[PDB]
Design an enzyme around this catalytic site. Sequence first.
Site, PDB file in Angstrom:
ATOM      1  N   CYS A  50       0.908  -1.270   0.009  1.00  0.00           N
ATOM      2  CA  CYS A  50      -0.033   0.187   0.094  1.00  0.00           C
ATOM      3  C   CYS A  50       0.887   1.309  -0.176  1.00  0.00           C
ATOM      4  CB  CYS A  50      -0.937   0.076   1.042  1.00  0.00           C
ATOM      5  SG  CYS A  50      -0.370  -0.164   2.904  1.00  0.00           S
ATOM      6  N   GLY A  73      -0.692  -0.956   7.203  1.00  0.00           N
ATOM      7  CA  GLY A  73      -2.221  -0.933   7.440  1.00  0.00           C
ATOM      8  C   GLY A  73      -3.158  -1.814   6.599  1.00  0.00           C
ATOM      9  N   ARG A  74      -3.241  -1.242   5.279  1.00  0.00           N
ATOM     10  CA  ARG A  74      -3.980  -2.213   4.109  1.00  0.00           C
ATOM     11  C   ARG A  74      -3.190  -3.341   3.932  1.00  0.00           C
ATOM     12  NH1 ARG A  74      -5.464   2.703   0.125  1.00  0.00           N
ATOM     13  NH2 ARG A  74      -6.099   4.367   1.505  1.00  0.00           N
TER      14      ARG A  74
END
Length: 489
Positions: free
Chosen positions: A415, A420-421
């Site tokens: 990402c 995170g993603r």
Amino acid sequence: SRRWFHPNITGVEAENLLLTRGVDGSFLARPSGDFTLSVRRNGAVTHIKIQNTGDYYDLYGGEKFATLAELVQYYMEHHGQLKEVIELKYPLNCADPTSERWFHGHLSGKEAEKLLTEKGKHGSFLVRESQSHPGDFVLSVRTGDSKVTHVMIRCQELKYDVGGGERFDSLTDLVEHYKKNPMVETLGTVLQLKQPLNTTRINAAEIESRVRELSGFWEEFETLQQQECKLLYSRKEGQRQENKNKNRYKNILPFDHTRVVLHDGDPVSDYINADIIMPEKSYIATQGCLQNTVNDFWRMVFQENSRVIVMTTKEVERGKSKCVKYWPDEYALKEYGVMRVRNVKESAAHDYTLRELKLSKVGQGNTERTVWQYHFRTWPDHGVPSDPGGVLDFLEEVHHKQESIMDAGPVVVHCSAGIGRTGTFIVIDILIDIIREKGVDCDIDVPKTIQMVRSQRSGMVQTEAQYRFIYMAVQHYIETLQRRIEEEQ
């Protein structure tokens, strides 16, 4: 130790605690995905905002971090960086035991015994609130190959004790002290506090009921966050001055024990902000390419024999560069240092674009291999998608492509910061992989899986919204699989 984080406190309460139990340089972190760093300076309290929309912890007027623990560790060692100069000298310890794995609170004597018998083993322990004695607590320990021993914890004038000896400021201080110095029974039984009772592992078929009970989600996520100071491994290689401009965010770094080491380099040429993610199918969790790291990215894909790339970001989001274009246009051929990449064909779906790339080493005839780039384009700028259908369809295709390629290396997932993603997508894939082979009636543990992945790359899965989305994605996969059985019957 993550005692500086107070999960159930207000602004004035934070100000009151720092002014009455703290000194100049005293600090604490607290939630509002908004967080606040409250610091005492010159007899006054200063509140610094920390924002997390799902990519990283963004301290206002400061730097970006993978974890709140790494944020605190940085400013405690780098004085002068925090300016309004705000010094982070003394952590203000929290007495709240609600974010501890061993704390069960609500449990009764019969409930604690039944759970220790069914789920516990030797050294398994829990702390519950006393039913007939309000304010007091009960420590239940399981010993054997078996028996359950109950130790009374009295609360006298804000202090905790087991009926004699030292008095502790919190239940955490008590548990930690009797962990290192265990209690001995009258007949010589050592009350060893080895591990807490697991209450997060669920049967994949009963996810609907667990999602309903958690709808809980905040309390389970914060309990997992409280375990991040056990994953403060060495990130020395990324901290080297020669590798400074190879990191998209200077403080979001790979671990030395899991970093991808690059070989056959130009005479530092062995570094890339990436980690091998091994579920304990492999993954490479990495950041979005920088202009000066595109050649290093293709060096990694080739060397690791990766045949699938998962891009979960747009090139630009909210007017900011998140990943530079490291692939050529459709039907074009581009050279990236010693590597050559051909974009054979682009196939567009509603949520993603598939790019059939051909990667080879310039000047070598039989090194060409197909690399499939799955570019997810519909993930929102902030937060998570309202429905997990798109991500699940995307991850099913990615999985079937990986499985169809003989001797394919780890799946490259990225990402912006690559935590995170990237963390959310890898965890959903790992959990779905268990169901893919064992079926609907199998054991799954969402925070245990995240913690294992976080020990391989710091801050994998950034927010509570992402944590809920993982549960929602597994639930949707179980439902669609069970509906497929009903249609066939």
